[PDB]
């Protein structure tokens, strides 16, 4: 395949120290590690809400196939908001293995999220902090994780939004959560060029230390 050729080259280029035989990289969303209200399509890169959006907890999350290996040093993925759907209650972030998936990322312990309706970051609590702008249909949201200093920043349409989280646990999974019908988002785990210039960021950071 040509899609997979470009993916392999980009992973090799961004994460030269990672041997995927030892630590496979996340390349798509997991069909097994998701809540029932999540549907996957487009080689498991596209996420859509498929629950009836009228229950006490409609929130539904999905984790990528693998956790981020430390040997990345710095890890990056981007999520494109194809459709904000009804209310655009969409969260992008990270979560540990086994975290409850009837939630948006960040509501629970060992779960971290940036939510589009309010621009708020969620760090193991149901109450957010003001962090960034809202985001909606058309926007690209990136999540950059530093495995060395255990911090994370997000990006919007190519622009850093500053550090959102510190004291991140290891072995976090890229995670997306949706809540209302019509919400659709796409992961780029490296299948495509990133909107954010992650290579330049990685260069600047390795010089800074």
């Amino acid at each position: 395949n040509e899609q997979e050729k470009e993916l392999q080259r980009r992973l090799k280029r961004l994460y030269p120290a990672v041997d995927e035989q030892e630590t496979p990289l996340p390349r798509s969303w997991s069909p097994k590690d998701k809540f029932s209200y999540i549907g996957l399509s487009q080689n498991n890169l596209r996420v859509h809400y498929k629950g009836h959006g009228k229950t006490p907890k409609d929130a539904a999350s999905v984790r990528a196939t693998h956790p981020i290996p430390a040997a990345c040093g710095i890890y990056y993925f981007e999520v494109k908001i194809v459709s904000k759907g009804r209310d655009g209650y969409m969260g992008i972030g990270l979560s540990a293995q086994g975290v409850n998936m009837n939630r948006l990322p960040g509501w629970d312990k060992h779960s971290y999220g940036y939510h589009g309706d309010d621009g708020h970051s969620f760090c193991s609590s149901g109450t957010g902090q003001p962090y960034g702008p809202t985001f909606t249909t058309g926007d690209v949201i990136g999540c950059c994780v530093n495995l060395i200093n255990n911090t994370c920043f997000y990006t919007k349409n190519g622009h850093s939004l500053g550090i959102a989280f510190t004291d991140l646990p290891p072995n976090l999974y890229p995670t997306v959560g949706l809540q209302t019908p019509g919400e659709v988002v796409d992961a780029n785990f490296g299948q495509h060029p990133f909107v954010f210039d992650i290579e330049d960021y990685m260069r600047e950071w390795r010089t800074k230390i």
Binding site: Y89, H120, G126, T127
Partner: peptide, 6 residues
């Protein structure tokens, strides 16, 4: 909402 609880 994005809050765990209305």
């Amino acid at each position: 909402e994005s809050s765990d609880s209305q």
